[PDB]
C-alpha cells in the first residue's frame, strides 16, 4: 500500500525509465489509471503494478 | 500497456486453448493434406 | 504472387478481422471508463467517499 504527496493506490513499485518533464507529477496510462509516479524526496519514475 | 490496466481491475485476458504455432500446424495440414 | 502484394500494402482487406479486435478493445475501453464515472454518487473512488 502506499501514498505519494496524498495520491493513494496499491501496486508494485519499481524502477522505470519512462522519462517526465520536471514540473510533472503523475504518469497516466490510456485507461486514466495511474501507471507511473515519480518519488517526491529522490526524483524517479517508479512504475505502479 | 492497455492489456496492463484491463489486468489491474479484474479483467483478464485467458490464453487462447491453441497458440499460433499450434493453428499453424493444422492449417499446414489440412494444407499439405489437400496438395 | 499477387495476393502477397495486395497483403503488402492493404490493411483494408482485413477489416473484418481488425474490427472484431477494436470492437473488444473499443467494449472493454468504455468498460473502464466507466469506472471514473460519478454515476450520481459524490465520487468514482471508492474509497474517498
Redesign the interface.
Known amino acids: 500500500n502506499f501514498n505519494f504527496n496524498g495520491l ?1 493506490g496499491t501496486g508494485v513499485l519499481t524502477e522505470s525509465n519512462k522519462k517526465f518533464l520536471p514540473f510533472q507529477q503523475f504518469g497516466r ?5 495511474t ?1 507511473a509516479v515519480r518519488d517526491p524526496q529522490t526524483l524517479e519514475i517508479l512504475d505502479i ?1 | 500497456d492497455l492489456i496492463c490496466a484491463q489486468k489491474f481491475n479484474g479483467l483478464t485476458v485467458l490464453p487462447p486453448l491453441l497458440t499460433d504455432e499450434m493453428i499453424a500446424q493444422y492449417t499446414s495440414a489440412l494444407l499439405a493434406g489437400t496438395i | 504472387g499477387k495476393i502477397q502484394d495486395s497483403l503488402s500494402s492493404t490493411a483494408s482487406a482485413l477489416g473484418k478481422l481488425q474490427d472484431v479486435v477494436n470492437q473488444n478493445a473499443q467494449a472493454l475501453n468504455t468498460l473502464v471508463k466507466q469506472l471514473s464515472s460519478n454515476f450520481g454518487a459524490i465520487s468514482s473512488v471508492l474509497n474517498d467517499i
Open positions: 493513494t496510462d490510456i485507461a486514466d489509471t501507471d503494478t
